[PDB]
Ligand binder design. Sequence first.
Ligand SMILES: CCCCCCC/C=C/CCCCCC(=O)OC[C@@H](O)CO
Ligand SMILES: CCCCCCC/C=C\CCCCCC(=O)OC[C@@H](O)CO
Ligand SMILES: CCCCCCC/C=C\CCCCCC(=O)OC[C@@H](O)CO
Ligand SMILES: CCCCCCC/C=C\CCCCCC(=O)OC[C@H](O)CO
Ligand SMILES: CCCCCCC/C=C\CCCCCC(=O)OC[C@H](O)CO
Ligand SMILES: CCCCCCC/C=C\CCCCCC(=O)OC[C@H](O)CO
Length: 463
Amino acid sequence: KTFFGQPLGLSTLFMTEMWERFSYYGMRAILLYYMWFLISTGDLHITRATAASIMAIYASMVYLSGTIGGFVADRIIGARPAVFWGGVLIMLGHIVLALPFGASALFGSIILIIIGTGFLKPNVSTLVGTLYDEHDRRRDAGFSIFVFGINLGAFIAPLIVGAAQEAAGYHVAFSLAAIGMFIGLLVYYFGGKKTLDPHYLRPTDPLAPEEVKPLLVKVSLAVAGFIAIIVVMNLVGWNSLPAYINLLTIVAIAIPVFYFAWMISSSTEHLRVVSYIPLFIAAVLFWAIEEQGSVVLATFAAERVDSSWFPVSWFQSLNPLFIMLYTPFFAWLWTAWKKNQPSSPTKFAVGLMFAGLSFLLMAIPGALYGTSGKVSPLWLVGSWALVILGEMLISPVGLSVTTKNSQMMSMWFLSSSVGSALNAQLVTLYNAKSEVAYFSYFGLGSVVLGIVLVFLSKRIQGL
Ligand SMILES: CCCCCCC/C=C/CCCCCC(=O)OC[C@@H](O)CO
Ligand SMILES: CCCCCCC/C=C\CCCCCC(=O)OC[C@@H](O)CO
Ligand SMILES: CCCCCCC/C=C\CCCCCC(=O)OC[C@@H](O)CO
Ligand SMILES: CCCCCCC/C=C\CCCCCC(=O)OC[C@H](O)CO
Ligand SMILES: CCCCCCC/C=C\CCCCCC(=O)OC[C@H](O)CO
Ligand SMILES: CCCCCCC/C=C\CCCCCC(=O)OC[C@H](O)CO
């Protein structure tokens, strides 16, 4: 008796992540429109450009805390309570938005989910591995099934939460995301006791008595500095929301920049570290375009599409839908393609070009029909079809390339945060008048950088 040939404990983690992703993407399917609504009622005193910028840097920070939660579980609290309390914090963030408050609660909600997701996201995946003994061949299949639950929860969420918003408003819709995470907690708590190893109720590499003080020193310096920077900013008058967004952008980009300067400074090993830079650049750019689906394309869906008969947030389901459609294809493909399968950097290259083609595609309707009318939903369908096609190329191979150390490995995960941070800047350039320029410009540029990468793709391979 199994769960698709896997240990029964996988079903518990399948359900857990499905409902967490449900809560996350259900919220992000409507959060932008929600901010638009608050602005329209004079409740939220920002521009739409700023609102969209918030979406991007919010994503960026969620990914950033994700690279930290694994450490916290392994060394301090344990993987299983990390997931649980991470879940509680996520639920609370959604609770906060369900309350009769308005713009005043946006910050508290965002902070809660950033921290909570950071605790839950990397450690659920960790617990999936713990189901299999070392050298169990089912491991790949198991993680593949787990990912399917992630995509599934991301697919039904905008459909259900978006419908709820249309029916009963934002506060009810947000409460459904909260309920979703709660379901995840229910199945996780009572399901984990039955099948998860008690070993992971505690940290696996707990701090040694001599390790505690320098860690405390380390984290307290970082906080002190961060606080100091925020102090100076307010003194010199750089205390607007765009200013803080710029600060987090800087932090998000400085972290990998420092790591690269750190590695390159500290002979044969070296060339590869330099060799990874164009790949890391290609990763950031792909994620940038891909992350804009919930921001720029969300705006385009709400303003430029004949979507009078269905909740416009439903467009956010296309991303995980195409992932699920493409997945069993590429599974077969990389297997059947035995003879001369492309290298990992080529995938990176072609992947970025596809993401670039997705934006180029979106430039056509405005150039052909103008940007004052509305166009068919199919333009967006085609765009997501393309960029997900690019994801199938670069995503399954991403951590594979970069692992050919500990900070270096984290940097694949950070490419997601940096592309999103870059988005916090670029996304403010998009509007009705600049639409055709925006898409063409960043579309062509991405393709060319993919063109460059394929030229470079052999030297890097050999290394
Ligand atoms: C792997 C999939 C490849 C997909 C790439 C591109 C395919 C889809 C392109 C979208 C064509 C636009 C649809 C035009 C249409 O239906 O007519 C409506 C007209 O009013 C235009 O707004
Ligand atoms: C919120 C809905 C779930 C019901 C749980 C009620 C218990 C309330 C407080 C105590 C919870 C601490 C649990 C920590 C933990 O590691 O749980 C995970 C493990 O037991 C199962 O996977
Ligand atoms: C451990 C408990 C988890 C419970 C999750 C939270 C959900 C429970 C109740 C949801 C509240 C519904 C929203 C109330 C509301 O004001 O709706 C909108 C109203 O203003 C008019 O449309
Ligand atoms: C199995 C492959 C099927 C699709 C081929 C891949 C993409 C190549 C070309 C797609 C079309 C490019 C955009 C042009 C376009 O949609 O024009 C539409 C009309 O202008 C709308 O009335
Ligand atoms: C592999 C996909 C191939 C798809 C078909 C080729 C697409 C090439 C260019 C499409 C964009 C052309 C739009 C028309 C346009 O902008 O006209 C401009 C006029 O001068 C404006 O007054
Ligand atoms: C399906 C595969 C790839 C399809 C994408 C091919 C599209 C080719 C070029 C993108 C759009 C062309 C730019 C149009 C343009 O800049 O003209 C200016 C407008 O008239 C006004 O802004």
